[PDB]
Nucleic acid binder design. Structure first.
Ligand SMILES: Cc1cn([C@H]2C[C@H](O)[C@@H](COP(=O)(O)OP(=O)(O)OP(=O)(O)O)O2)c(=O)[nH]c1=O
Ligand SMILES: [Ca+2]
Ligand SMILES: [Ca+2]
Length: 430
DNA sequence: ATAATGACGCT
DNA sequence: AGCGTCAT
Protein backbone atom coordinates (compact mmCIF):
# COMPACT_ATOMS: atom_id res chain seq x y z
CA UNK A 1 0.00 0.00 0.00
CA UNK A 2 0.94 3.64 0.85
CA UNK A 3 2.85 2.45 3.96
CA UNK A 4 5.16 0.29 1.88
CA UNK A 5 8.78 1.46 1.96
CA UNK A 6 10.41 0.86 -1.41
CA UNK A 7 14.06 1.56 -0.64
CA UNK A 8 14.22 4.56 -2.97
CA UNK A 9 15.36 7.17 -0.42
CA UNK A 10 19.02 7.25 -1.47
CA UNK A 11 21.18 7.51 -4.56
CA UNK A 12 24.21 5.26 -4.06
CA UNK A 13 27.03 4.50 -6.49
CA UNK A 14 29.84 1.98 -6.36
CA UNK A 15 32.93 2.78 -8.41
CA UNK A 16 35.37 0.00 -9.29
CA UNK A 17 38.68 0.37 -11.16
CA UNK A 18 39.11 -1.83 -14.24
CA UNK A 19 41.85 -4.48 -13.78
CA UNK A 20 43.43 -2.07 -11.32
CA UNK A 21 47.03 -3.31 -10.74
CA UNK A 22 47.36 -3.88 -14.52
CA UNK A 23 46.31 -0.28 -15.26
CA UNK A 24 48.82 1.02 -12.71
CA UNK A 25 51.60 -0.92 -14.45
CA UNK A 26 50.32 0.12 -17.88
CA UNK A 27 50.36 3.83 -16.99
CA UNK A 28 54.00 3.51 -15.97
CA UNK A 29 54.99 1.31 -18.93
CA UNK A 30 53.41 2.39 -22.25
CA UNK A 31 54.68 -0.85 -23.84
CA UNK A 32 52.04 -2.76 -21.83
CA UNK A 33 49.10 -0.62 -22.96
CA UNK A 34 46.34 -2.25 -25.03
CA UNK A 35 48.08 -5.59 -24.89
CA UNK A 36 47.35 -8.90 -23.19
CA UNK A 37 49.16 -8.46 -19.90
CA UNK A 38 49.09 -9.53 -16.29
CA UNK A 39 50.53 -8.61 -12.91
CA UNK A 40 52.45 -11.34 -11.17
CA UNK A 41 54.07 -11.74 -7.79
CA UNK A 42 57.26 -13.74 -7.33
CA UNK A 43 58.64 -15.50 -10.39
CA UNK A 44 60.73 -18.42 -9.25
CA UNK A 45 57.82 -20.80 -8.68
CA UNK A 46 56.10 -21.48 -12.02
CA UNK A 47 56.73 -17.90 -13.20
CA UNK A 48 54.83 -16.37 -10.28
CA UNK A 49 51.19 -16.12 -9.25
CA UNK A 50 49.01 -13.91 -11.42
CA UNK A 51 46.96 -11.41 -9.41
CA UNK A 52 45.53 -9.10 -12.09
CA UNK A 53 44.71 -9.63 -15.73
CA UNK A 54 44.07 -7.13 -18.56
CA UNK A 55 40.82 -7.63 -20.45
CA UNK A 56 42.79 -8.44 -23.64
CA UNK A 57 44.42 -11.35 -21.78
CA UNK A 58 41.12 -12.41 -20.22
CA UNK A 59 39.89 -13.15 -23.77
CA UNK A 60 42.55 -15.90 -23.95
CA UNK A 61 41.22 -17.46 -20.72
CA UNK A 62 43.89 -16.05 -18.41
CA UNK A 63 42.67 -15.68 -14.84
CA UNK A 64 43.76 -14.67 -11.35
CA UNK A 65 45.67 -17.24 -9.24
CA UNK A 66 46.91 -18.93 -12.42
CA UNK A 67 50.68 -19.58 -12.53
CA UNK A 68 52.31 -17.30 -15.06
CA UNK A 69 53.82 -20.29 -16.88
CA UNK A 70 50.34 -21.76 -17.26
CA UNK A 71 48.98 -18.43 -18.55
CA UNK A 72 51.63 -18.40 -21.28
CA UNK A 73 50.18 -21.74 -22.47
CA UNK A 74 46.82 -20.00 -23.13
CA UNK A 75 48.37 -16.73 -24.33
CA UNK A 76 51.97 -17.00 -25.57
CA UNK A 77 52.17 -13.23 -26.20
CA UNK A 78 51.22 -12.42 -22.58
CA UNK A 79 53.20 -9.47 -21.21
CA UNK A 80 54.04 -9.47 -17.51
CA UNK A 81 54.77 -6.83 -14.92
CA UNK A 82 55.87 -7.97 -11.50
CA UNK A 83 55.02 -6.62 -8.09
CA UNK A 84 57.84 -4.81 -6.31
CA UNK A 85 59.53 -7.11 -3.85
CA UNK A 86 61.05 -5.70 -0.65
CA UNK A 87 62.63 -7.71 2.17
CA UNK A 88 61.64 -10.93 0.43
CA UNK A 89 57.96 -10.11 0.33
CA UNK A 90 55.49 -8.41 -1.96
CA UNK A 91 55.16 -4.65 -1.58
CA UNK A 92 51.94 -3.08 -2.76
CA UNK A 93 52.93 0.54 -2.19
CA UNK A 94 52.57 1.53 -5.84
CA UNK A 95 48.95 0.33 -5.80
CA UNK A 96 48.06 1.86 -2.40
CA UNK A 97 49.36 5.20 -3.70
CA UNK A 98 47.54 4.85 -7.01
CA UNK A 99 44.48 4.14 -4.87
CA UNK A 100 44.86 7.41 -2.97
CA UNK A 101 44.97 9.30 -6.29
CA UNK A 102 41.53 7.94 -7.17
CA UNK A 103 39.98 8.24 -3.70
CA UNK A 104 40.86 11.91 -3.26
CA UNK A 105 39.28 12.76 -6.64
CA UNK A 106 36.04 10.92 -5.73
CA UNK A 107 36.09 12.68 -2.35
CA UNK A 108 35.68 15.97 -4.24
CA UNK A 109 32.13 15.00 -5.25
CA UNK A 110 30.82 13.27 -2.13
CA UNK A 111 31.29 11.34 1.08
CA UNK A 112 32.93 8.07 0.11
CA UNK A 113 33.31 4.69 1.77
CA UNK A 114 36.61 3.05 0.78
CA UNK A 115 35.51 -0.56 0.26
CA UNK A 116 38.87 -1.86 -1.00
CA UNK A 117 42.11 -0.68 -2.60
CA UNK A 118 40.16 0.09 -5.80
CA UNK A 119 36.45 0.39 -4.84
CA UNK A 120 34.43 3.18 -3.22
CA UNK A 121 30.77 3.64 -2.40
CA UNK A 122 29.40 7.12 -2.93
CA UNK A 123 26.22 8.47 -1.34
CA UNK A 124 25.03 10.95 -3.99
CA UNK A 125 21.65 11.87 -2.44
CA UNK A 126 22.62 15.45 -1.50
CA UNK A 127 24.60 16.14 -4.68
CA UNK A 128 21.66 14.94 -6.78
CA UNK A 129 19.09 17.11 -4.94
CA UNK A 130 21.37 20.12 -5.37
CA UNK A 131 21.95 19.42 -9.08
CA UNK A 132 18.17 19.02 -9.50
CA UNK A 133 18.02 22.70 -8.52
CA UNK A 134 20.71 23.65 -11.06
CA UNK A 135 18.37 22.29 -13.72
CA UNK A 136 14.99 24.04 -13.54
CA UNK A 137 13.07 20.99 -14.81
CA UNK A 138 15.42 20.98 -17.81
CA UNK A 139 15.37 17.63 -19.64
CA UNK A 140 18.44 15.42 -19.42
CA UNK A 141 20.21 14.93 -22.75
CA UNK A 142 21.52 11.50 -23.83
CA UNK A 143 24.85 13.30 -24.31
CA UNK A 144 25.22 13.76 -20.55
CA UNK A 145 25.25 9.96 -20.25
CA UNK A 146 27.67 8.75 -22.92
CA UNK A 147 28.82 5.50 -21.16
CA UNK A 148 25.65 4.62 -19.20
CA UNK A 149 23.58 1.40 -19.47
CA UNK A 150 19.99 1.29 -18.29
CA UNK A 151 19.50 -2.24 -16.96
CA UNK A 152 16.45 -3.97 -18.42
CA UNK A 153 16.23 -1.67 -21.46
CA UNK A 154 15.65 -1.56 -24.41
CA UNK A 155 12.45 -3.58 -24.24
CA UNK A 156 9.90 -4.39 -26.95
CA UNK A 157 9.62 -2.79 -30.44
CA UNK A 158 20.31 -3.11 -33.21
CA UNK A 159 22.87 -5.88 -33.74
CA UNK A 160 25.80 -4.03 -32.11
CA UNK A 161 26.56 -3.20 -28.46
CA UNK A 162 26.45 0.57 -28.59
CA UNK A 163 23.25 0.48 -30.60
CA UNK A 164 21.46 -1.44 -27.84
CA UNK A 165 22.96 0.85 -25.16
CA UNK A 166 21.59 3.97 -26.83
CA UNK A 167 18.15 2.52 -27.62
CA UNK A 168 17.87 1.60 -23.93
CA UNK A 169 18.95 5.09 -22.82
CA UNK A 170 16.54 6.72 -25.29
CA UNK A 171 13.62 4.61 -24.03
CA UNK A 172 14.58 5.48 -20.45
CA UNK A 173 15.00 9.20 -21.08
CA UNK A 174 11.85 9.49 -23.23
CA UNK A 175 9.73 8.17 -20.36
CA UNK A 176 11.45 10.20 -17.62
CA UNK A 177 9.39 12.20 -15.07
CA UNK A 178 11.48 15.43 -15.10
CA UNK A 179 9.02 17.92 -13.57
CA UNK A 180 8.96 15.77 -10.41
CA UNK A 181 12.01 16.38 -8.22
CA UNK A 182 10.96 13.50 -5.93
CA UNK A 183 10.88 10.82 -8.64
CA UNK A 184 13.41 8.14 -7.61
CA UNK A 185 14.13 7.36 -11.25
CA UNK A 186 14.94 10.99 -11.93
CA UNK A 187 17.27 11.09 -8.94
CA UNK A 188 19.11 7.97 -10.22
CA UNK A 189 19.38 9.52 -13.69
CA UNK A 190 20.87 12.69 -12.20
CA UNK A 191 23.03 10.41 -10.06
CA UNK A 192 24.30 8.73 -13.25
CA UNK A 193 25.14 12.12 -14.78
CA UNK A 194 27.33 12.99 -11.82
CA UNK A 195 29.07 9.59 -11.93
CA UNK A 196 29.85 10.23 -15.62
CA UNK A 197 31.57 13.44 -14.50
CA UNK A 198 33.38 11.71 -11.62
CA UNK A 199 34.63 9.04 -14.01
CA UNK A 200 35.70 11.66 -16.58
CA UNK A 201 37.66 13.44 -13.84
CA UNK A 202 39.32 10.22 -12.68
CA UNK A 203 40.43 9.31 -16.19
CA UNK A 204 41.54 12.87 -17.02
CA UNK A 205 43.64 13.25 -13.88
CA UNK A 206 45.01 9.71 -13.38
CA UNK A 207 44.69 8.00 -16.76
CA UNK A 208 42.78 5.20 -15.04
CA UNK A 209 39.50 3.82 -16.36
CA UNK A 210 36.75 2.37 -14.17
CA UNK A 211 33.22 1.05 -14.09
CA UNK A 212 30.38 2.15 -11.83
CA UNK A 213 26.94 1.05 -10.64
CA UNK A 214 24.23 3.56 -9.68
CA UNK A 215 21.18 2.52 -7.72
CA UNK A 216 19.27 3.05 -4.48
CA UNK A 217 21.57 1.12 -2.11
CA UNK A 218 25.05 -0.44 -1.88
CA UNK A 219 24.21 -4.02 -2.82
CA UNK A 220 22.35 -3.02 -6.02
CA UNK A 221 25.10 -0.51 -6.91
CA UNK A 222 27.77 -3.17 -6.52
CA UNK A 223 25.65 -5.60 -8.59
CA UNK A 224 24.89 -2.87 -11.16
CA UNK A 225 28.63 -2.09 -11.52
CA UNK A 226 29.61 -5.55 -12.77
CA UNK A 227 26.92 -5.73 -15.45
CA UNK A 228 28.78 -3.66 -18.07
CA UNK A 229 32.55 -3.84 -17.58
CA UNK A 230 35.10 -2.38 -18.49
CA UNK A 231 34.84 1.43 -18.84
CA UNK A 232 31.03 1.62 -18.50
CA UNK A 233 28.39 2.41 -15.87
CA UNK A 234 25.02 0.92 -15.17
CA UNK A 235 21.89 2.35 -13.68
CA UNK A 236 19.73 -0.27 -11.96
CA UNK A 237 16.30 1.14 -11.15
CA UNK A 238 13.92 -0.10 -8.47
CA UNK A 239 11.54 -1.16 -11.28
CA UNK A 240 14.24 -3.23 -12.95
CA UNK A 241 14.75 -5.43 -9.88
CA UNK A 242 12.02 -8.06 -10.37
CA UNK A 243 13.19 -9.14 -13.84
CA UNK A 244 16.86 -8.72 -12.90
CA UNK A 245 16.50 -10.81 -9.74
CA UNK A 246 14.29 -13.37 -11.50
CA UNK A 247 17.35 -15.14 -13.01
CA UNK A 248 20.07 -13.78 -10.77
CA UNK A 249 21.98 -16.59 -9.01
CA UNK A 250 21.92 -16.01 -5.26
CA UNK A 251 25.75 -16.16 -4.94
CA UNK A 252 26.10 -12.92 -6.97
CA UNK A 253 24.61 -10.72 -4.27
CA UNK A 254 27.22 -9.20 -1.94
CA UNK A 255 27.62 -11.24 1.29
CA UNK A 256 25.76 -14.21 -0.24
CA UNK A 257 28.80 -15.49 -2.17
CA UNK A 258 29.88 -17.92 0.58
CA UNK A 259 28.31 -20.35 3.12
CA UNK A 260 25.16 -18.34 3.98
CA UNK A 261 24.34 -18.12 0.27
CA UNK A 262 24.88 -21.89 -0.14
CA UNK A 263 22.64 -22.72 2.81
CA UNK A 264 20.00 -20.34 1.47
CA UNK A 265 20.12 -22.43 -1.69
CA UNK A 266 20.10 -25.81 0.05
CA UNK A 267 17.60 -25.15 2.78
CA UNK A 268 15.03 -23.27 0.71
CA UNK A 269 15.56 -25.28 -2.47
CA UNK A 270 15.91 -22.25 -4.75
CA UNK A 271 18.46 -20.79 -7.20
CA UNK A 272 17.70 -17.17 -7.98
CA UNK A 273 17.46 -14.07 -5.83
CA UNK A 274 13.84 -13.30 -6.71
CA UNK A 275 12.50 -16.64 -5.44
CA UNK A 276 13.19 -15.33 -1.91
CA UNK A 277 10.07 -13.11 -2.11
CA UNK A 278 7.70 -16.03 -1.67
CA UNK A 279 8.82 -16.55 2.00
CA UNK A 280 7.65 -14.54 5.04
CA UNK A 281 10.18 -12.57 7.04
CA UNK A 282 9.55 -14.90 9.98
CA UNK A 283 10.39 -17.95 7.85
CA UNK A 284 13.65 -16.42 6.64
CA UNK A 285 14.43 -15.41 10.20
CA UNK A 286 13.84 -18.95 11.50
CA UNK A 287 16.25 -20.41 8.92
CA UNK A 288 19.05 -17.87 8.97
CA UNK A 289 18.66 -15.74 12.09
CA UNK A 290 16.82 -12.50 12.84
CA UNK A 291 19.43 -10.22 11.21
CA UNK A 292 19.90 -12.36 8.09
CA UNK A 293 16.19 -13.10 7.74
CA UNK A 294 15.29 -9.42 7.89
CA UNK A 295 18.06 -8.48 5.50
CA UNK A 296 17.09 -11.21 3.03
CA UNK A 297 13.42 -10.30 3.12
CA UNK A 298 14.10 -6.66 2.23
CA UNK A 299 17.02 -7.35 -0.16
CA UNK A 300 15.17 -9.70 -2.51
CA UNK A 301 12.76 -6.79 -3.07
CA UNK A 302 15.70 -4.47 -3.85
CA UNK A 303 15.60 -2.86 -0.40
CA UNK A 304 18.67 -2.45 1.83
CA UNK A 305 19.67 0.05 4.50
CA UNK A 306 23.43 -0.34 5.05
CA UNK A 307 24.66 3.26 4.92
CA UNK A 308 27.66 4.55 3.02
CA UNK A 309 30.05 5.01 5.94
CA UNK A 310 32.13 8.17 5.84
CA UNK A 311 35.55 6.49 5.79
CA UNK A 312 38.28 7.10 3.23
CA UNK A 313 41.22 5.65 5.15
CA UNK A 314 41.64 1.97 6.12
CA UNK A 315 41.17 1.21 9.87
CA UNK A 316 44.03 -1.30 9.99
CA UNK A 317 47.52 -1.47 8.48
CA UNK A 318 48.97 -4.92 7.93
CA UNK A 319 51.65 -7.04 6.29
CA UNK A 320 51.50 -10.78 5.74
CA UNK A 321 53.46 -13.48 3.95
CA UNK A 322 52.52 -17.12 3.26
CA UNK A 323 55.14 -19.89 3.46
CA UNK A 324 53.51 -22.79 1.59
CA UNK A 325 54.62 -26.42 1.79
CA UNK A 326 58.38 -26.97 1.79
CA UNK A 327 59.01 -23.28 2.58
CA UNK A 328 57.15 -23.41 5.94
CA UNK A 329 59.23 -21.88 8.74
CA UNK A 330 60.81 -24.61 10.89
CA UNK A 331 63.33 -22.87 13.18
CA UNK A 332 63.37 -20.04 15.73
CA UNK A 333 65.80 -18.02 13.60
CA UNK A 334 63.47 -18.06 10.57
CA UNK A 335 60.43 -17.04 12.58
CA UNK A 336 62.36 -14.18 14.17
CA UNK A 337 63.89 -12.96 10.94
CA UNK A 338 60.60 -12.92 9.02
CA UNK A 339 58.74 -11.23 11.88
CA UNK A 340 61.48 -8.61 11.58
CA UNK A 341 61.01 -8.25 7.82
CA UNK A 342 57.25 -7.84 8.43
CA UNK A 343 57.84 -5.41 11.27
CA UNK A 344 60.17 -3.27 9.15
CA UNK A 345 57.68 -2.74 6.31
CA UNK A 346 54.97 -2.11 8.87
CA UNK A 347 57.07 0.57 10.59
CA UNK A 348 57.68 2.46 7.30
CA UNK A 349 53.97 2.41 6.50
CA UNK A 350 52.91 3.38 10.04
CA UNK A 351 55.35 6.32 10.10
CA UNK A 352 54.00 7.39 6.70
CA UNK A 353 50.45 7.01 8.02
CA UNK A 354 51.21 9.07 11.13
CA UNK A 355 52.57 12.04 9.12
CA UNK A 356 49.80 11.92 6.50
CA UNK A 357 46.71 11.20 8.52
CA UNK A 358 47.42 12.50 11.99
CA UNK A 359 46.88 9.32 13.98
CA UNK A 360 48.71 6.49 15.71
CA UNK A 361 48.05 2.77 16.04
CA UNK A 362 47.88 1.54 19.65
CA UNK A 363 47.52 -2.22 19.28
CA UNK A 364 49.59 -4.86 17.49
CA UNK A 365 47.81 -8.03 16.38
CA UNK A 366 49.87 -11.13 15.54
CA UNK A 367 48.40 -13.93 13.43
CA UNK A 368 49.97 -17.23 12.40
CA UNK A 369 48.98 -20.31 10.43
CA UNK A 370 50.40 -23.74 11.24
CA UNK A 371 51.05 -26.53 8.74
CA UNK A 372 48.01 -28.70 7.98
CA UNK A 373 45.44 -26.17 9.15
CA UNK A 374 43.03 -25.11 6.35
CA UNK A 375 41.81 -21.98 8.21
CA UNK A 376 43.27 -18.54 7.29
CA UNK A 377 44.43 -17.99 10.88
CA UNK A 378 45.56 -20.71 13.25
CA UNK A 379 45.91 -18.23 16.10
CA UNK A 380 45.69 -14.50 16.86
CA UNK A 381 47.32 -12.66 19.78
CA UNK A 382 47.81 -9.00 20.72
CA UNK A 383 50.11 -6.65 22.54
CA UNK A 384 50.37 -2.90 23.03
CA UNK A 385 51.80 -0.95 20.14
CA UNK A 386 53.70 1.83 21.92
CA UNK A 387 56.60 2.58 19.55
CA UNK A 388 56.86 2.59 15.80
CA UNK A 389 60.00 0.49 16.06
CA UNK A 390 60.53 -2.61 13.93
CA UNK A 391 62.84 -4.42 16.35
CA UNK A 392 60.48 -3.85 19.28
CA UNK A 393 57.37 -4.86 17.35
CA UNK A 394 58.98 -7.99 15.96
CA UNK A 395 60.26 -8.89 19.42
CA UNK A 396 56.87 -8.34 21.11
CA UNK A 397 55.19 -10.31 18.35
CA UNK A 398 57.53 -13.22 18.91
CA UNK A 399 56.82 -13.07 22.63
CA UNK A 400 53.05 -13.41 22.26
CA UNK A 401 53.31 -16.38 19.85
CA UNK A 402 56.44 -18.19 21.07
CA UNK A 403 54.69 -20.73 23.32
CA UNK A 404 52.76 -22.06 20.30
CA UNK A 405 56.07 -23.78 19.55
CA UNK A 406 55.46 -27.42 20.46
CA UNK A 407 59.02 -28.51 19.61
CA UNK A 408 61.26 -30.27 22.13
CA UNK A 409 64.42 -28.64 20.79
CA UNK A 410 64.63 -24.88 21.42
CA UNK A 411 66.16 -23.94 18.04
CA UNK A 412 63.45 -25.81 16.14
CA UNK A 413 59.90 -24.66 15.47
CA UNK A 414 57.00 -27.07 15.09
CA UNK A 415 54.44 -27.31 13.76
CA UNK A 416 56.06 -25.35 10.92
CA UNK A 417 54.43 -21.98 10.24
CA UNK A 418 52.75 -21.46 6.87
CA UNK A 419 51.86 -17.77 7.42
CA UNK A 420 53.00 -14.80 9.49
CA UNK A 421 50.76 -11.74 9.83
CA UNK A 422 51.24 -8.45 11.72
CA UNK A 423 48.46 -5.86 11.79
CA UNK A 424 48.42 -2.40 13.42
CA UNK A 425 44.94 -1.43 14.74
CA UNK A 426 43.02 0.77 17.23
CA UNK A 427 44.14 4.13 15.87
CA UNK A 428 43.91 7.25 18.05
CA UNK A 429 44.05 10.85 16.79
CA UNK A 430 47.50 12.48 16.92
C1' DA B 1 52.19 -23.66 -3.83
C1' DT B 2 47.68 -18.05 -4.92
C1' DA B 3 48.77 -13.58 -2.39
C1' DA B 4 48.21 -9.96 0.39
C1' DT B 5 45.57 -7.72 2.13
C1' DG B 6 40.95 -5.57 4.43
C1' DA B 7 36.00 -5.08 7.24
C1' DC B 8 33.11 -6.91 10.45
C1' DG B 9 30.01 -10.56 13.01
C1' DC B 10 29.63 -13.89 16.91
C1' DT B 11 30.69 -15.30 21.46
C1' DA C 1 39.67 -11.45 23.65
C1' DG C 2 39.91 -14.66 20.02
C1' DC C 3 37.88 -17.04 16.31
C1' DG C 4 34.84 -17.14 11.81
C1' DT C 5 32.88 -15.10 7.42
C1' DC C 6 33.13 -12.55 3.30
C1' DA C 7 35.18 -9.60 0.28
C1' DT C 8 39.11 -7.34 -3.27
C1 LIG D 1 40.48 -10.16 -5.90
C2 LIG D 1 41.89 -9.79 -5.62
C3 LIG D 1 42.39 -8.61 -6.07
N1 LIG D 1 43.64 -8.28 -5.84
C4 LIG D 1 44.19 -7.00 -6.34
C5 LIG D 1 44.47 -7.06 -7.82
C6 LIG D 1 43.33 -6.31 -8.48
O1 LIG D 1 43.75 -5.57 -9.56
C7 LIG D 1 42.87 -5.40 -7.38
C8 LIG D 1 41.37 -5.24 -7.37
O2 LIG D 1 40.74 -6.43 -7.67
P1 LIG D 1 39.39 -6.63 -8.38
O3 LIG D 1 38.58 -5.42 -8.45
O4 LIG D 1 38.83 -7.75 -7.80
O5 LIG D 1 39.94 -6.98 -9.82
P2 LIG D 1 40.48 -6.12 -11.01
O6 LIG D 1 40.61 -4.76 -10.71
O7 LIG D 1 41.75 -6.58 -11.35
O8 LIG D 1 39.55 -6.41 -12.22
P3 LIG D 1 38.09 -5.94 -12.52
O9 LIG D 1 38.23 -5.08 -13.60
O10 LIG D 1 37.51 -7.16 -12.80
O11 LIG D 1 37.64 -5.31 -11.31
O12 LIG D 1 43.38 -5.89 -6.16
C9 LIG D 1 44.46 -9.18 -5.14
O13 LIG D 1 45.61 -8.87 -4.93
N2 LIG D 1 44.01 -10.35 -4.69
C10 LIG D 1 42.77 -10.71 -4.88
O14 LIG D 1 42.33 -11.77 -4.49
CA1 LIG E 1 38.46 -3.71 -9.90
CA1 LIG F 1 37.46 -4.17 -6.79
Amino acid sequence: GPHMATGQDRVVALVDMDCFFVQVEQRQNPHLRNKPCAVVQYKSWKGGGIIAVSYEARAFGVTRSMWADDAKKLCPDLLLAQVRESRGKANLTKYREASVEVMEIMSRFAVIERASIDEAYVDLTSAVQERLQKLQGQPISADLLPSTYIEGLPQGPTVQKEGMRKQGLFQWLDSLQIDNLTSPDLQLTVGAVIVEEMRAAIERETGFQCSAGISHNKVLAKLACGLNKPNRQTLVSHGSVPQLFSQMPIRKIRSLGGKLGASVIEILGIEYMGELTQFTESQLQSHFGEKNGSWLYAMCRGIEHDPVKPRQLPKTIGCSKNFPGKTALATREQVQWWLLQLAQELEERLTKDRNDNDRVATQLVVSIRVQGDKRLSSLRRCCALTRYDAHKMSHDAFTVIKNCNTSGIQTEWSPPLTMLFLCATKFSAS
